[PDB]
Design a protein around this ligand. Structure first.
Ligand SMILES: *[Se]c1ccccc1C(=O)NCc1cccc(OC)c1
Ligand SMILES: COc1cccc(CNC(=O)c2ccccc2[SeH])c1
Ligand SMILES: [Cl-]
Ligand SMILES: [Cl-]
Ligand SMILES: [Zn+2]
Ligand SMILES: [Zn+2]
Ligand SMILES: [Zn+2]
Lengths: 153, 153
């Protein structure tokens, strides 16, 4: 019933299109699309709090964390709402994204509309990095590309 | 009390930053910012229905029109929610935007978060152009720049 979309762009050559679809306000969100221009391997994938691209991806602020929790992976009870883990780029630098998430929403509350989706330089350690930053950002490094999450037809 | 922001970009020289602020949920929205790279004179200024920039500004669809009205100017009863009239560029190609609007909102069914803000090639005739297109688009021509309307800090 609800469909939202995000175009990922940045200061480098990373670009992507990410779709989100939610059948019921109570339901899981299906996340699918493609990102290119990435280094092979894991890249942290998160919804950040602000849909503000004024100065590029830095203006999006921290991970979306309406419930004041620590950073984790998407399968964890202890996570930020915005914690979608990692996408994986192949040797051609392409990530084919296919995620199902029960914590993000497109309606009701915990809504990601108007926020920023960010793909990161490094792997998200999912809060298992063994340092203080692990349970805040997952040590995923800089913001390679981002976009504001908008309502689709 | 609620703040939202939009970065306008397109295929050519037009770029801008637009801020929106609403003190009360029932209250007027203040709209301010600047756009550059424009031809001198009036440029139609609209919130479009989809926050979909996947194929540039064309994917944003028609004017945001949750109340199924005809096109008009911001100071008309008969208007789309997204009808913000025109911004005015000077001989340097700069529009300094300063609008207060009582119809758009930053909450509820009039909310513009997750929609697209578009600045157009031509003047919006505010539905007074007398042709059929006047009461749909205002004859404002192509989409020079746009962005998804996001939540700000
Ligand atoms: Se408004 C609107 C329109 C479309 C989708 C979501 C929303 C919305 O109300 N989102 C929640 C929210 C939470 C914090 C701040 C905010 O605006 C600044 C909106
Ligand atoms: C379609 O008509 C609407 C009716 C009420 C609210 C809205 C916009 N606000 C929301 O949808 C919203 C509000 C609070 C938390 C999360 C979300 Se997603 C639209
Ligand atoms: Cl971060
Ligand atoms: Cl149009
Ligand atoms: Zn997090
Ligand atoms: Zn328009
Ligand atoms: Zn209109």
């Amino acid at each position: 019933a609800t469909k939202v979309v995000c175009v990922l762009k940045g200061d480098g050559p990373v670009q992507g299109i990410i779709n989100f679809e939610q059948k019921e306000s109570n339901g899981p969100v299906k996340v699918w699309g493609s990102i290119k221009g990435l280094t092979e391997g894991l890249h942290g994938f998160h919804v950040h709090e602000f849909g503000d691209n004024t100065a590029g991806c830095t203006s999006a602020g921290p991970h979306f964390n309406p419930l004041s929790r620590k950073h984790g992976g998407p399968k964890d009870e202890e996570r930020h709402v915005g914690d979608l883990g990692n996408v994986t780029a192949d040797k051609d630098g392409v990530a084919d994204v296919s995620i199902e998430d029960s914590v993000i929403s497109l309606s009701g509350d915990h809504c990601i509309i108007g926020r920023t989706l960010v793909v990161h330089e490094k792997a998200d350690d999912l809060g298992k990095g063994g340092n203080e930053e692990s349970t805040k950002t997952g040590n995923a490094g800089s913001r390679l590309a981002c976009g504001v999450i908008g309502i689709a037809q």
